Amino acid sequence: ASNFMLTQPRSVSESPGKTVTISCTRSSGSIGSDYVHWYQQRPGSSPTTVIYEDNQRPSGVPDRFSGSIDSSSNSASLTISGLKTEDEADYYCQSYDRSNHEVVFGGGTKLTVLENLYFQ
Amino acid sequence: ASNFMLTQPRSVSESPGKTVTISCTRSSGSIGSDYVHWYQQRPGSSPTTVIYEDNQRPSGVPDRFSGSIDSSSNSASLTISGLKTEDEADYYCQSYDRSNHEVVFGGGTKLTVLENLYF
Amino acid sequence: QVQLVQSGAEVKKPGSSVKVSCKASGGTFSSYAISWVRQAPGQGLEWMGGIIPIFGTANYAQKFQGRVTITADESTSTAYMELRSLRSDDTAVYYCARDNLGYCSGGSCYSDYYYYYMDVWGQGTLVTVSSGG
Amino acid sequence: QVQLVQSGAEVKKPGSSVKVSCKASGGTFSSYAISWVRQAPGQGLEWMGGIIPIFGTANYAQKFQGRVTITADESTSTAYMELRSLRSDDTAVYYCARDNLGYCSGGSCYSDYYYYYMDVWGQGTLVTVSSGG
Amino acid sequence: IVCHTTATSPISAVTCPPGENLCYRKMWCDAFCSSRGKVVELGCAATCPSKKPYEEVTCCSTDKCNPHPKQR
Amino acid sequence: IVCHTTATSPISAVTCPPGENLCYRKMWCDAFCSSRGKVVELGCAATCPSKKPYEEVTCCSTDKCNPHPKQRPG
């Protein structure tokens, strides 16, 4: 039996100062059955926790970061308000599969902060 | 209708450097049914906690202070090793009566440090 | 490092009331309970009751129920003990004292009252009541 | 602060083994689980398994159970991953990562394995497997 | 719907947001269960919250149907 | 009697002191019960420990009769 999957968009790009959301959908089992945690990984660095237990922020993490769960879509989301260039990184959601006794990571999302003033 | 009682000796006296124990006996109900805490009150001062949850020390309290529970005698004890003159104070135990929903204090023990040597 | 600061000593005639205040530094009681504890001269500590502002409820000891009222205003982070029908046995030092274990965290709260150890104490307020009925 | 320091990068022939260390300093060791997580170049994090020294047993991911052994030496506060029969798909950065929630305290321990969020990570160890096999 | 909530100070009754037409009560033990009793979380919800092991979750759909034990 | 205990690292089996002729298991939930299951306390006792609300205690009197959930026989 395979673990459940946590599916995230691979690439998300947004302009500074805006709010961006990154989702993490659990393929089987209820998202509320297991807490979802979120890590930030800057290039060349180890991951750090940005959200734990769905919506809790470790000390030191900017309060522009928040976490939520949506039961209807079976997903967890990381929301970043007031997006800044320093938030560019990869982001991973993580949970646990009780049946197989294994950690499950989402596949990652790269967040890019756009540098263009105008759009085509 | 009455709360249980927590009985402590009224007075304890001992030379410095020695170890003293102050007991607190619960009159009805098991001592282990409710946490016991211990306060120190110096004359003219408010109480401060020296032991909570039977045997935990708050931050800043010297490790010379320890707490224990003896189920067979239905008592809680505060132990002070390496007794110092600054340990002179009144000591109170405290627990809680679930049936009456009240805090219960022991009667207090006055600790005195003896300076002359005795037989 | 919250402190509790009480009002000053008072001397009262029998039958009168006293209302002692206890102001918490920091501008909030959060989900903590505040007790009132008294100590008659040369005697032991005695719990009178307490209040949990976040529930808006107060708990009293039988010895004082019906004569004492304990209140608190979150807006001024001040708690009060009003003791009526004062008599000689009421000459005592009165202390307020915070329950170390808050009643709520993370948006949820405990079900039952249970007075835990008292970490922060006020400085005490001496109330002296003169003789007679 | 608890810190995890890993051994240096290695380059290995196919079919060989690699053993990567993770020395923990600054906290309790026996009671906390350490996981190994790998990340192949430009790919995602993958959990390989972990060890809870106080139970003396390791938990493995099914993908790696046949080839990986995870151990821990209390005497040196060091966890190890040994990965055998290396192939090109094993070229990756290998992290150790400590589970935030310890398994025993105060003389009692939890019932179940449950890998929680990982607060402290090592710096990673790149293992590159050369071609062939 | 108006539901009790433990997210406010003091704990209170709130008009639930749009689409949240249930009140819920979610309880579990923490390390103080043996003295303080269960932890109780009260609030609004769109669907009855999922429960993990050792959690109890009950929902109801009349105003203030989910009081805290001490306001009841 | 020989009992399992959670007073050691790793968890282990110990010969109980004289006069302690029972093994016990005490379990309860903490906030993490929903992920890690019950907290388990194992040891030796002279009399079966008394339980507070929300705690369970069982005692038994054959060797190793009180295993942790991850150390039950097979």
Residue numbers in the entry:
A (entry chain M): 145 to 264
B (entry chain C): 145 to 263
C (entry chain B), D (entry chain I): 1 to 133
E (entry chain X): 1 to 72
F (entry chain Z): 1 to 74
Article excerpt on this structure:
Here, we use a panel of human monoclonal antibodies with neutralizing activity to long-chain α-neurotoxins (LNTxs) to investigate pH-dependent antigen binding. To establish the molecular basis for pH-dependent antigen binding in these antibodies, we determined at five different pHs the crystal structures of two neutralizing antibodies (A01 and D11) with different pH-dependent binding affinities to LNTxs from the elapids Naja kaouthia and Bungarus multicinctus. Collectively, these results provide a basis for the neutralization of LNTxs by the A01 and D11 mAbs by receptor mimicry, thereby inhibiting toxin interactions with the nAChR through the heavy-chain CDR-H3 loop.
We also sought to crystallize and determine the structure of D11 in complex with α-bungarotoxin for comparative analysis because it displays less pH-dependent antigen binding as compared to A01, and also because it is known to neutralize several LNTxs, including α-bungarotoxin from the elapid B. multicinctus, both in vivo and in vitro. Due to the known reactivity of the D11 mAb to α-bungarotoxin and the moderate sequence identity (SI) between α-bungarotoxin and α-cobratoxin (60% SI), we selected α-bungarotoxin for further crystallization trials at pH 6.5 and pH 7.5 with the D11 scFv. The total buried interface surface areas of both scFvs bound to their respective LNTx were 923.6 Å2 and 963.4 Å2 for the A01 and D11 antibody-toxin complexes, respectively, according to a Proteins, Interfaces, Structures, and Assemblies (PISA) interaction analysis. The differences in the interaction surface areas are attributed mainly to the light chains, with the D11 light-chain having a larger interaction surface area than the A01 light-chain. Finally, a structural alignment of α-bungarotoxin bound to the D11 mAb and to its target receptor, the muscle-type nicotinic acetylcholine receptor (nAChR) isolated from Pacific electric ray (Tetronarce californica) revealed an equivalent network of hydrogen bonds and cation–π interactions between the CDR-H3 loop and the loop C in the nAChR, mimicking the interaction with α-bungarotoxin. Particularly conspicuous interactions are Tyr99CDR-H3, Tyr100iCDR-H3, and Cys100e (backbone carbonyl), which occupy similar hydrogen bonding networks as loop C residues from nAChR Tyr189, Tyr190, and Tyr189, respectively. By contrast, D11 forms a hydrogen bond with the backbone carbonyl of Ser34 on finger II of α-bungarotoxin through the side chain of Arg93CDR-L3. By contrast, His34CDR-L1 in D11 participates in additional interdomain interactions that may contribute to a more stabilized paratope and heavy-light-chain interface at both pH values. The interdomain (chain interface) interactions in D11 are stabilized by hydrogen bonds and hydrophobic interactions between CDR-H3 tyrosine residues Tyr100jCDR-H3, Tyr100lCDR-H3, and Tyr100mCDR-H3 and light-chain residues Asp31CDR-L1, Tyr49FWR-2, and Glu50CDR-L2 in the neighboring protein environment of His34CDR-L1.
